[PDB]
Symmetry: D2
Subunit: 212 residues, 4 copies
C-alpha cells in the first residue's frame, strides 16, 4: 500500500463485516447498521494519527496516572450527500464534534470547480479535518473539496480523508494532487466500472444507506 | 502480559481516551460518552477472537468478492449493575444482540455462591458469551458468574470477559480458576486499595457512569 | 381512569405502535426499537408533570423570548432487570440524567422486604424520581422500591412511575399504598394470568427485549 | 392557527425545551441534544396524521388484542444541508426509514428553480413524505422542493412539512402555493429580520447544530 494510505487492519472480523455490507442481499437496516460500525472503525483509525502530549492525570483517591492529553482540535467535513452518513460515526467518537459541509462541482460551462455550498468552522485553519466521503472512486469531488479547505487555511498535513472503500484510480488521482493528505480506508478494491463505480464494490453506497 | 489476556493496543489515542475517564474532574456526560467509546473498542477486540469461514460474496453488478461469514453466535451477559453500561456498546456493534443477566453473590451464612437473578438465552450453550463487567478488581463476581454459565453448558473457550480496567490481583484470581477464558481489557493497573478499588483506577465506575 | 393515573393519549399511531410490540410475531430488533420509541413517549409524558418558571430568554440578535426554565431536578431509578431497558429512553430525553437502581425482594423467611442492591444520587431527596418498570402487573416490586425512596427522603409527590402497560390489579395495589404517586402508563389491560402476566399483554417484556 | 398548520401542544415542558435551544448561551452539545429531542416530537406529531386500520393482534399466550396496523408507507426528504440534522430523529421513530434529498435553488440567470441534487425512493409516489427543514422562514426552498416531489408523483395530501420554528411570512407563502400540505411546527414566531432570519428565533440553526 502506498505512502500516506492507511488501511484498516484486514482482520477476519473486518472482512466478515465488509462482507455484510457488500452482499447484494443485505437490506437497508443491516446495511446502515454495519456501515455505521465500519465508519466508527475508520474514525478511530484516523484519530490514531492525531498528536498527544504526556500529562499527569489525577485519579480519585489521590492517585496519579501517567496519561496523555489530546493536542489536535478536530472537525469533520462531508462533501457529497453520501458523506452525511458518516457524521453519526464521527459524533459517536468525538463528543459534539463540529461538522462542516462542502458541496462543489465542476462548472459545466467553464470546466473549473464551482462551490454550491460551504459551511465550515470559523477556526478551521487551526483544526485537523476529517474529510468524509464513503467511496473513493475517481476522487473528483474530494480533490475539489480539499482545494477549498486549503484556500481556507487548513494545513495539508492536518487533512485526513476517511472512506469505506477506494479504487486504485482514485487513490492515485488524489495522491498525485495532494500527496501529504492521509487516506484512511477500509479496503482497496480492483478497478472502476464504466459508470465509475468501484468493483467489486458494494453497489451505490448512498442509495443503499438511504433509499433502497 | 499473561496467556489469554488480550490488552487493547496502547496507542496514544487510547491513552488520551482513558485519561479522560480517569481524570477526577471529568463530569458524568463526558465520562459516559468516552466510556461508551472505550466499551465499543473492547467489543471490537473481543469480536476479533471469533471464528469466520471464507465465503464468496455476490456484489451488485454481478461481481464476486472473496469475503467471509461469521461462524460464532453471540450474546452478552452482564453481571453487576455496573455491567449494564456495557450493553449499549455491544448493541452498537452486534445488531439486536441477545444480552443476558447473572446476579450472583456469596451466601453470607454458607459462604457458597447464591444466584439472585438469571436470564440467559435458551441456546446459550451454543453461543460465544461476552461477560460484561467494567472493572476486574478482585474478580469475585465474574468468577461466580462464569460458574453459572458453565453449569448452563457454555463452552469454556467461548467465554470472553470484557472489562475497561483490571488489577493484577483480579487477573490472577480469575485465570487461576478459568485459565481458558480470554480476558479482553483496556488497561492493567497497579494494585487494589483497601476497599478493593483499582489503583490508580478511575474512582467508582458505576457511580460515575450513573449517579454522581 | 383513576386519579393520579396518566394514560398516554390513545391515538391511532400509539395503538399501531403498541400493536407492533404486542404482536407475538414481532422479532427482537423491532421489539427493542419500538419499545424504545414508546419509552420515550412515557418519559415525555412524565416530564410534562414537572414544574417550570417563566423566564426571559435572550436569543441571538438581541431579541427576547418569553420562555421558561425547568424547576425540577430529575433522576431515573430502575427496579428489576427489565427496567434497565428504559434507561436509554430517559437519557435520550434528559441529557446525561442520573439513573439509580433499587433491587429489592421479599425475604422468603421473614416475608418482609429485603434490599439486594441500592445505588441512588446523594441528593435524591431533592429530586423528582422516574421509577422505571416496564410492566405494572402486581406492583409488588414497585411498591417495595417506593418505600426505599421514601426512606431516603424522596417526596411522595415527586415520584412518577413509568410503565409501558399496567393491569388493573397493579394500579389498584400500588395506588392503595401510594395514592400520591403518579402512574404514567401507555395502556391499561384487562387482568393478570395465573403466572401474573398482563393479559392480553405482550408476553414477557424482558425476555423479548433482551433474550429471545 | 391556520388550516393545515399543526402546532405541537405548547406545554410548559415544550416551552422549557425550546427555551434551551433558543438561549444564545446554550452551547453546541446541549443545542444538538435538545434539538434532536424536539425533532422527535415533530416526527411523532407528523406520524399522528397517517392512516391506520383496525387489526386483531395475536399476543403471547393465545390472547387477542383489538389493535391497528399502519397503512402509510413513509420516507423523509431533507432539503437544505440544515434538514440533515432531522434525519436522526426520523430514524429513531421509524425503523430504517428511507430518506431522500432534494437540493434545489433558483437559477440566478433565469430566476427559475434549478435542481442541484436529487435522490428519492423509486416508489416515492406511493409514500407519505416528511419534508425536513428546521426553519420555515421564507419557505422559498421548501416550496421549490415540494414542486419536485409533485413532479415525481407524490400526492399533495401525503406531504407533511416538519420544522422546529416558522415565521408567519413563510407559513403564508407556503400555504398560498400548497394549501393541502400539512405544516407540523413547534412554534410560530413573530416576523423575519432583514437577513430573513426568524425573530426572536434561535440564531442560525445549522451553524449552531454543526459548527459553532
Ligand atoms: O485526538 C483527539 C482529539 C479530540 N478528540 C475529541 O474530540 C472532541 C472535540 O475536540 P475539539 O478540541 O475539536 O473541541 P472543540 O474545539 O470543538 O470544543 P469547544 O471549543 O466547542 O468547547 C473532544 O471531546 C475531544 O476529546 C478526540 O477524541 N481525539
Ligand atoms: O463474529 C461475529 C458474529 C456475529 N456478529 C453479529 O452479531 C449479530 C448477532 O449474531 P447471532 O448469530 O448471535 O444472531 P442471533 O442468533 O441472536 O439472531 P436471531 O436468531 O435472533 O435471528 C449479528 O448481526 C452478527 O452479524 C458479529 O458482528 N461478529
Ligand atoms: O423538566 C425537566 C427537568 C430537567 N430536564 C433535563 O434533565 C437534565 C437533568 O436535569 P437536572 O437538573 O437533574 O441536572 P443534574 O442535577 O443531574 O446536573 P448536574 O448537577 O450533573 O450538572 C437537564 O439537561 C435538564 O435540562 C428536562 O428535560 N425537563
Ligand atoms: O404510521 C406509520 C407508518 C410507518 N411507521 C414505521 O415506519 C417504518 C417504515 O415503514 P414503510 O412501510 O415505509 O417501510 P418500507 O417500505 O421502507 O420497508 P421495506 O420495504 O424496506 O421493507 C416501519 O417500521 C413502520 O413501522 C410508523 O412508525 N408509523
Amino acid at each position: 500500500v502506498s505512502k500516506n494510505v492507511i488501511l484498516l487492519p484486514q482482520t477476519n472480523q473486518l472482512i466478515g463485516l465488509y462482507s455484510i455490507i457488500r452482499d447484494q442481499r443485505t437490506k437497508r437496516g443491516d446495511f446502515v447498521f454495519y456501515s455505521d460500525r465500519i465508519i466508527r472503525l475508520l474514525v478511530e483509525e484516523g484519530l490514531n494519527q492525531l498528536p498527544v502530549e504526556e500529562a499527569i492525570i489525577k485519579c480519585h483517591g489521590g492517585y496519579e496516572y501517567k496519561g496523555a492529553k489530546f493536542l489536535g482540535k478536530i472537525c469533520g467535513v462531508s462533501i457529497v450527500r453520501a458523506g452525511e452518513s458518516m457524521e453519526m460515526g464521527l459524533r459517536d467518537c468525538c463528543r459534539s464534534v463540529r461538522i462542516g459541509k462542502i458541496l462543489i462541482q465542476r462548472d459545466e460551462e467553464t470546466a473549473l470547480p464551482k462551490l454550491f455550498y460551504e459551511k465550515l468552522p470559523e477556526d478551521i485553519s487551526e483544526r485537523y479535518v476529517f474529510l468524509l466521503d464513503p467511496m473513493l472512486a475517481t476522487g473528483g469531488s474530494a480533490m475539489m473539496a480539499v482545494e477549498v479547505l486549503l484556500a481556507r487555511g487548513v494545513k495539508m498535513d492536518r487533512i485526513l480523508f476517511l472512506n469505506l472503500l477506494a479504487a486504485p484510480e482514485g487513490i492515485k488521482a488524489f495522491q498525485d494532487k495532494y500527496p501529504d493528505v492521509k487516506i484512511i480506508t477500509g479496503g482497496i478494491d480492483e478497478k472502476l466500472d464504466e459508470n465509475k463505480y468501484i468493483v467489486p464494490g458494494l453497489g451505490d453506497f448512498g442509495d443503499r444507506y438511504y433509499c433502497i
